[PDB]
């Protein structure tokens, strides 16, 4: 308004006269929790926009439902699913068949009795010992590592572990460990600081009775 | 790293950072004993006193007169709240975003201190976290060199 006496009229537009009631956003309920007054106010994560509402037809954007199926000639054909039990490559000598079989079991196969350890980076073990999950006095056999939630169940598969001096240029205190197959540097790191490392290599029958004695 | 710490020591940041040398956990019985108080009586040390990995309690506030308006807690295992997820891991897309998950305070006076760091990364604020986009594991390293400088 150039002058206050002639106020600009309120003649609404399609950006005012067509709105909706303000539901409470997760900020307006974070400020003033005095308004979350029913479970219809606990609306989902903002990232969850809502259920799928359109046909993501390939080669043509995301079509609406009830839209035109002139161009979904291959969406009706990528909804059945990939051929099951059938070569993916219809012509052109599949790239797998072209390459030669190597190492009759495979290039990284694990047979019954393979020596493949899960890597317990020394930084992890050194990080714990100061944090206070591990006691530096007691020779830190894998029970302590498992029960102190340093390593979970999903990482101790036979045989137990492998100590890896990962970026650890120094170990400050005399540290004793009973683990399985430390790396040669990880050994010469503990052994410099007056520690020990007596690599226990237990059978599977021994792997149990050490974790659940 | 000192090389990154300049890219914070250069910034026009309120809430100044600790000097680098005093921010270091990494430097007279026998030319001075080790850090973790192994005293002269046959060397009894104290457990959580020295750490070769780099763990240490928060150094504390920047300077006494100022009051920092955000507080970034530590995780249950010690390290800091920065996590670098990826857009659309299912397709293994190499376009990453960070997430600052364990903070309390006013994220906006926290996020308004990330903007001065990354004047080009889209930063969004949410109730618990602070998403900053297009910043990968090197940005993860810039944060902690800051969240240590702030004294958390």
């Amino acid at each position: 308004e150039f002058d206050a006496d002639h106020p600009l009229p309120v003649v609404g537009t399609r950006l005012n006269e067509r709105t909706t009631t303000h539901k409470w956003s997760h900020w307006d309920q974070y400020i003033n929790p005095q308004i979350t007054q029913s479970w219809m106010y606990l609306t989902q994560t903002p990232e969850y926009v809502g259920p799928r509402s359109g046909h993501n037809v390939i080669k043509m954007g995301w079509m609406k439902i009830g839209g035109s199926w002139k161009y979904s000639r291959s969406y009706n054909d990528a909804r059945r699913g990939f051929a099951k039990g059938q070569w993916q490559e219809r012509k052109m000598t599949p790239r797998f068949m072209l390459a030669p079989r190597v190492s009759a079991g495979g290039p990284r196969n694990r047979y019954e009795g393979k020596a493949s350890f899960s890597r317990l980076s020394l930084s992890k073990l050194l990080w714990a010992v100061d944090t206070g999950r591990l006691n530096p006095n007691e020779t830190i056999t894998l029970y302590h590592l498992r029960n102190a939630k340093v390593i979970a169940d999903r990482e101790v598969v036979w045989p137990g572990m492998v100590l890896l001096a990962g970026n650890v240029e120094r170990v400050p205190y005399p540290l004793h460990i009973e683990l399985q197959n430390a790396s040669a540097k990880a050994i010469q790191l503990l052994e410099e600081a007056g520690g020990s490392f007596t690599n226990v290599y237990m059978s599977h029958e021994g792997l149990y009775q050490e974790l659940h004695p | 790293r000192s090389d990154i710490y300049d890219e914070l020591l250069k910034l026009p940041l309120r809430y100044a950072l600790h000097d680098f040398r005093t921010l270091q956990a990494h430097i007279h019985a026998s030319s001075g004993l080790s850090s973790a108080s192994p005293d002269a009586p046959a060397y009894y040390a104290v457990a959580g006193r020295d750490s070769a990995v780099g763990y240490a309690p928060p150094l504390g506030p920047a300077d006494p007169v100022d009051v920092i308006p955000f507080f970034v807690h530590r995780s249950s295992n010690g390290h800091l709240p920065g996590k670098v997820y990826s857009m659309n891991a299912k397709t293994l897309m190499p376009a990453f975003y960070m997430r600052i998950q364990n903070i309390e305070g006013d994220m906006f006076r926290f996020e308004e201190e990330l903007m001065k760091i990354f004047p080009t990364k889209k930063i969004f604020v949410r109730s618990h976290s602070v998403y900053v986009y297009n910043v990968n594991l090197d940005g993860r390293a810039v944060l902690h060199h800051w969240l240590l400088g702030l004294g958390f």
Binding site: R170, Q188, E192 | H26
Partner: peptide
């Protein structure tokens, strides 16, 4: 290279405490 640059008489294996010549002394600079 590490022992000479430190003016030290040669040593090998040069154990890991001595290696990283007391924080890889930075070759005095």
């Amino acid at each position: 290279d590490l022992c000479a640059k430190m003016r030290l008489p040669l040593e090998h294996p040069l154990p890991l405490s001595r290696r990283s010549q007391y924080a890889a002394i930075h070759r005095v600079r």
